[PDB]
Amino acid sequence: MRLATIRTNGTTIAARVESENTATTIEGFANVGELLQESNWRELAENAAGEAVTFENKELDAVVPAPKKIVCVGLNYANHIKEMGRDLPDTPTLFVKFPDALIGPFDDVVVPEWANKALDWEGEMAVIIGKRARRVKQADAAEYIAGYAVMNDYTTRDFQYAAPAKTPQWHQGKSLEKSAGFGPWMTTPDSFEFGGELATYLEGEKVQSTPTNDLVFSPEKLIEYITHIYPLDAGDVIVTGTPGGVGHARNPQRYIGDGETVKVEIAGLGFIENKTVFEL
Amino acid sequence: MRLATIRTNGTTIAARVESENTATTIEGFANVGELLQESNWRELAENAAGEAVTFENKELDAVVPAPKKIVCVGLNYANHIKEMGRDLPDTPTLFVKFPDALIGPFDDVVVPEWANKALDWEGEMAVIIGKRARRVKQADAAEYIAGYAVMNDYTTRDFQYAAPAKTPQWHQGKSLEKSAGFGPWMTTPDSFEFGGELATYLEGEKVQSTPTNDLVFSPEKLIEYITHIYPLDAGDVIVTGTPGGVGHARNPQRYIGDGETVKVEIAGLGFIENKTVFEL
Numbered sequence: 001m002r003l004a005t006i007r008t009n010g011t012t013i014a015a016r017v018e019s020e021n022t023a024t025t026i027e028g029f030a031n032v033g034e035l036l037q038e039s040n041w042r043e044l045a046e047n048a049a050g051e052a053v054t055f056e057n058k059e060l061d062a063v064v065p066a067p068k069k070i071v072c073v074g075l076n077y078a079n080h081i082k083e084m085g086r087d088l089p090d091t092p093t094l095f096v097k098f099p100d101a102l103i104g105p106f107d108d109v110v111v112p113e114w115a116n117k118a119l120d121w122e123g124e125m126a127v128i129i130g131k132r133a134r135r136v137k138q139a140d141a142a143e144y145i146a147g148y149a150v151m152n153d154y155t156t157r158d159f160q161y162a163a164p165a166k167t168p169q170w171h172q173g174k175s176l177e178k179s180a181g182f183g184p185w186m187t188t189p190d191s192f193e194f195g196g197e198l199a200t201y202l203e204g205e206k207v208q209s210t211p212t213n214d215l216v217f218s219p220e221k222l223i224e225y226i227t228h229i230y231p232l233d234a235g236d237v238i239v240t241g242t243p244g245g246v247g248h249a250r251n252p253q254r255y256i257g258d259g260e261t262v263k264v265e266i267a268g269l270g271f272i273e274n275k276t277v278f279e280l
Numbered sequence: 281m282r283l284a285t286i287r288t289n290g291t292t293i294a295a296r297v298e299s300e301n302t303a304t305t306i307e308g309f310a311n312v313g314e315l316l317q318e319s320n321w322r323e324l325a326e327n328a329a330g331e332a333v334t335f336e337n338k339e340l341d342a343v344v345p346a347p348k349k350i351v352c353v354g355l356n357y358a359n360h361i362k363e364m365g366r367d368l369p370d371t372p373t374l375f376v377k378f379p380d381a382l383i384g385p386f387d388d389v390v391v392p393e394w395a396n397k398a399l400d401w402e403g404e405m406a407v408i409i410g411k412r413a414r415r416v417k418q419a420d421a422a423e424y425i426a427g428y429a430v431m432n433d434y435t436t437r438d439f440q441y442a443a444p445a446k447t448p449q450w451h452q453g454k455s456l457e458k459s460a461g462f463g464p465w466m467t468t469p470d471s472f473e474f475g476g477e478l479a480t481y482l483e484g485e486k487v488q489s490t491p492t493n494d495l496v497f498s499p500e501k502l503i504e505y506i507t508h509i510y511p512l513d514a515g516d517v518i519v520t521g522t523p524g525g526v527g528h529a530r531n532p533q534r535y536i537g538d539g540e541t542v543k544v545e546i547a548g549l550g551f552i553e554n555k556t557v558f559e560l
């Protein structure tokens with residue numbers, strides 16, 4: 001099952017994706033997040049009976065546009081850990097992206113002048129929570145996963161490493177409003193092969209390539225760790241980390257310039273494609 | 281003016297505080313956060329005409345129990361930073377506390393076994409946002425402040441510094457479920473003057489002390505800095521940082537034990553008083 005948030009001329013719906021450009025409206029929900037608040041969301045999706053829609057890629061909204069929590073994971077692929085001069089961790093690294101950072105999977109990333117100096121890509125697999133998860137053990141955690149999608153953890157590296165200078169808190173470089181493409185839609189775990197290639201492209205050149213089963217901490221381990229600190233609600237998002245090949249780590253160093261496009265693709269999940277636009 | 285969220289048996293109300301133990305119900309709102317979503321909240325509050333109530337300390341809820349954002353600041357007291365022999369920062373340190381962390385100003389902090397090893401206090405002022413703030417200049421920022429309150433940025437120091445070892449992301453030690461006392465009520469800026477003492481007490485012994493007008497980054501500066509990255513909505517909260525005297529920095533290191541109380545008082549705003557209780 002594939003669930004999308006679709007906006008036709010500014011108006012959003014929750015929709016069952018039927019093909020690359022057709023969907024069935026699921027009545028009574030503005031978006032997939034609202035749907036996931038219902039315990040019978042799978043049933044409602046299986047009985048979609050609203051307007052039939054034909055959609056362009058730019059009409060896809062952030063698949064869950066208003067999660068209460070987007071918990072981002074740092075340093076969760078060996079190759080990324082190595083390139084950033086770090087040790088293989090004993091403990092998951094967590095930091096927060098506010099939902100104001102989310103954009104549609106094909107939306108332009110409009111960057112203001114003060115934020116445009118060190119723009120970087122981080123292609124990541126997202127996990128979407130299907131019901132309230134509190135103090136959940138790893139062995140039970142898969143029950144709490146509604147499905148998966150793709151996100152760009154779109155980064156302002158100069159803000160990310162600003163403060164404090166010695167042990168910078170990354171949050172301010174990881175939550176630029178309207179920066180993080182999210183979709184194209186949520187795939188349920190019954191409907192793709194977990195573990196496939198995560199690939200990122202800048203202006204059509206492949207800059208990231210790693211299988212998702214090289215994750216150091218599994219979605220299940222991430223749910224156990226996070227949920228012994230605070231709960232995750234239906235519709236909340238875990239962003240499981242980026243593999244190697246980020247622009248900040250490259251020889252030579254490479255940042256996103258005006259008009260450049262970052263595509264992120266995960267085998268079985270589809271892709272997002274976001275053009276950076278420097279503000280007027 | 282002073283605004284409280286008060287639990288009344290199976291219900292909760294927004295109220296205008298009349299005395300330390302009385303208030304006037306503000307009709308049509310469950311909490312101060314809901315009230316702040318109205319354009320004319322200030323008027324609705326001044327003209328409160330609902331039922332007079334008598335409340336106990338333990339019936340106060342978190343003054344804004346469901347903010348969308350709690351943005352917490354790092355080092356922010358100038359004379360504290362200078363006496364550690366550090367430079368004043370030019371850029372704010374920001375990290376996120378999830379609203380699941382909030383409790384009432386007199387609530388017990390109930391802690392599970394895995395979190396109870398390095399419990400520490402941070403007495404701070406809270407700034408509550410009064411209307412939507414996006415790209416607000418420092419000169420204009422006072423207009424966006426609804427008022428002030430007190431928070432304990434209650435910390436699990438072992439979690440805070442866990443990962444990654446060399447530049448730890450504090451979030452996981454700053455967002456423990458049901459940890460952070462918040463209130464006792466919100467004071468409007470016309471009824472508060474900066475300069476008074478912020479003090480924290482452990483078991484009635486003073487452990488922190490600073491004048492409130494010794495900030496590196498004013499509420500106004502923080503609103504400008506934050507709102508050029510993402511918006512703040514009515515009812516969102518900036519927690520403006522803690523001075524010296526935290527348990528973790530002491531010799532010997534002094535963490536909160538089972539049954540111990542932390543009082544955080546700011547002259548002109550009131551105080552909060554939270555007893556730590558290890559869960560059985």
Ligand SMILES: [Mn+2]
Pocket residue numbers: 072073074122124153241242
């Ligand atoms: Mn990332």
Ligand SMILES: [Mn+2]
Pocket residue numbers: 352353354402404433521522
């Ligand atoms: Mn603090």
